[model samples]
Target: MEIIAISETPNHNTMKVSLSEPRQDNSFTTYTAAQEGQPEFINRLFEIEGVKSIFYVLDFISIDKEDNANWNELLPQIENTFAKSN
Candidate 1:
């Protein structure tokens, strides 16, 4: 996966991480899971401790975290997840 960028959203618990390639061609949210049709990498993203939601669309992955969690602690894990996704 070629990462394009990562930025925090207005909400402290939210972030927008982008990739050069599409993670999903269409819009999907963790208001649901990466349950049925999603790939294993996405399923694992759901397994993250602080991950509240994942709004996946095209190259953009909009991530939501738990209120009490910090991005510094969580993002490395998020980065780690994608790294191993290969």
Candidate 2:
């Protein structure tokens, strides 16, 4: 499955869209970290019951979940992941 989210820049200069899809190889890192291979933050996400993929950018993060997952259930997990990283 895939998910898409869009956010306007703080200054309202541009619009951005993020897309996430099903993935099993959780080998990415959060934007807070300078590198990509570290899994400290991303690993926290994989702990979720049904998350499948994620795509992140400068101002937003998008996540994909299993067929049975609900946004209400997945959103908190995403929020928590960002909180711990920040």
Candidate 3:
């Protein structure tokens, strides 16, 4: 797992955290898995205690806070959920 810091775009806030690359296998099956799994994984993350905002791109997930919540408490849960999905 990797953490990246990003500046917000016009659609979102100024600070955000995103999940980075996944392991590559690049054949049809791998592409299919990525297509199907990402949305399910992100949906699972929304159930986490402090995960209030989510943005998904082809290979990353970007998130913002819905409240002034502590990331220390939230990051692990989100990370764990992401790992489980993978």
Top-lDDT candidate index: 1
Using lDDT as the yardstick, the better of models 2 and 3 is: 2
Candidate 3, position 54, lDDT: 56
The list of candidate 2 runs beyond 4 A from truth reads 1-40, 71-86
Q: Cα lDDT of model 3 overall?
A: 0.49
Q: What are the lDDT figures for the candidates, one per model?
A: 0.63, 0.49, 0.49
Please give the ranking of all candidate structures by TM-score, highest first, separated by commas.
1, 3, 2
Q: Residue by residue across 6-44, what tens digits does model 1's lDDT show?
A: 775678777777677644456665563558776644565
- Give per-model TM-scores: 0.59, 0.37, 0.39
Candidate 1 residue pairs in backbone clash: none
- Better candidate number, 1 or 2, judged by lDDT: 1
Question: Where is model 1 more than 4 Å wrong at Cα?
Answer: 31-44
The order by descending lDDT is 1, 2, 3
lDDT by residue (tens digit), candidate 2, 13-79: 2334455533555445433322456654456556655555666554345555565554455456656
lDDT of 3 at 66: 51
